[PDB]
């Protein structure tokens, strides 16, 4: 079906925040059912990753709405919490870059797991605090029952 070069174009557009050409693409040129399968060449990062890291809340909400509408509930959960080769969720990137609006959207409405641990052993909770993004970190500590471990 959908080749690498066109998967790249789709996620470069998520990165840029061109929501206009995104709706364009998924109403006419590609099935919205396939949005959840577009992954970058090198990283395996999804379009959710790109939009999330860049704080494009409207693009992020669209991506989520579309995936939710076009896929099973199981497929939606597996998408929001999808990890790249380095083991990072979109949430991880959003927390590193301190994008609060995206984070509340991911965790409140679409129930993202901030406890997923990457190849280095870090979860979104760590990443937020490690990049001095205190607003995102304080949100995590209110929202979830976060304690130290073994």
């Amino acid at each position: 079906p959908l080749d690498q070069e066109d998967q790249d174009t789709i996620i470069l557009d998520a990165r840029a925040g061109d929501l206009d050409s995104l709706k364009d693409i998924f109403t006419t040129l590609v099935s919205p059912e396939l949005l959840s399968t577009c992954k970058e060449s090198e990283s395996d990062s999804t379009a959710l990753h790109m939009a999330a890291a860049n704080g494009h809340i409207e693009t992020v909400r669209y991506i989520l709405e579309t995936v939710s509408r076009a896929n099973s509930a199981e497929d939606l959960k597996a998408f929001v919490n999808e990890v790249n080769k380095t083991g990072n969720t979109a949430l991880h990137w959003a927390s590193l870059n301190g994008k609060l609006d995206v984070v509340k959207l991911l965790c409140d409405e679409y129930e993202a797991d901030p406890f997923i641990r990457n190849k280095f052993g870090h979860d979104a909770i760590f990443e937020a605090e490690n990049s001095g993004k205190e607003e995102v970190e304080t949100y995590f500590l209110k929202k979830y029952d976060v304690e130290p471990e073994d």
Binding site: R15, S43, M50, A53, G55, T86, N88, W93, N97
Partner: peptide
């Protein structure tokens, strides 16, 4: 630089 770049550099 955009947030994706920061993220990928960090990885």
């Amino acid at each position: 630089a955009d947030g994706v770049f920061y993220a990928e550099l960090n990885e």
